[model samples]
Target: SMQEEDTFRELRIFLRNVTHRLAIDKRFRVFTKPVDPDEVPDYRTVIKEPMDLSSVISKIDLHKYLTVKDYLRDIDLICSNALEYNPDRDPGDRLIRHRACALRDTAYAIIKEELDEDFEQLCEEIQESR
Candidate 1:
């Protein structure tokens, strides 16, 4: 639910209302062109302000977060629907989802304090295109 546009227990909808506005302003391009990986900080890599994880953590649901390992199949299903909301169908257009899943992988690893092939597999599926 991109609030106006948002994710599962992902960021809130209102944030997307603001995100959509920013994309409109070309603060970041939602109507983006296909830049070559050779592209620079603009289209190839439109960097945004860093997220203050501390501030944002309050919005995340621990139950769902842990469920990545607790129940991998459900998370896999959610990501397939996630792709429908994406405008980019290109092979490499997973930056946004990639980072988000990376964070999940990080958190999951930290909580368990180690990596397991099982965790890696589930995490990778969530990170990759469904």
Candidate 2:
């Protein structure tokens, strides 16, 4: 169960404290302003299981948001200016990988709940050209 309070909380946290990831340090400095990722409710806010996310769909396009293109770009930004390779760091470290994976899953949960059906219908609208 997750939503604006929880789901985006994770997204917000990641986007916020990414500086510590060591991978995204440069971009973090250039773009992101520091924020406390700990402000989430309790900080725990469940999005009621299926309803998953509310504050995200409006902010990011779920389908294209992380589909290879999106993640690769972010990974590049994250990998930018890396003084050294550290499998011990984000997208490499097991825990970090798991966090990323969860974020990925959470995004999908959002799509499944809010966009999938409509998106599938839109996909089906193609004239099925022979």
User: Best by lDDT, which number?
Assistant: 1
Please report how far candidate 2 places residue 118 from its true position, in Å: 3.8
- How many steric overlaps are in each model, in order? 4, 4
- Among all windows of ten consecutive residues in candidate 2, which has the lowest summed lDDT? 43-52
List CA RMSD, all candidates. 15.0, 15.4
Give lDDT tens digits, candidate 1, residues 1-130.
2431122333233222322332343222322232234644353233222222322233233322332343334323233333433438565557645533543443434435533456446444554543
How much lDDT does each candidate structure score? 0.36, 0.34
Compute the lDDT for candidate 2.
0.34
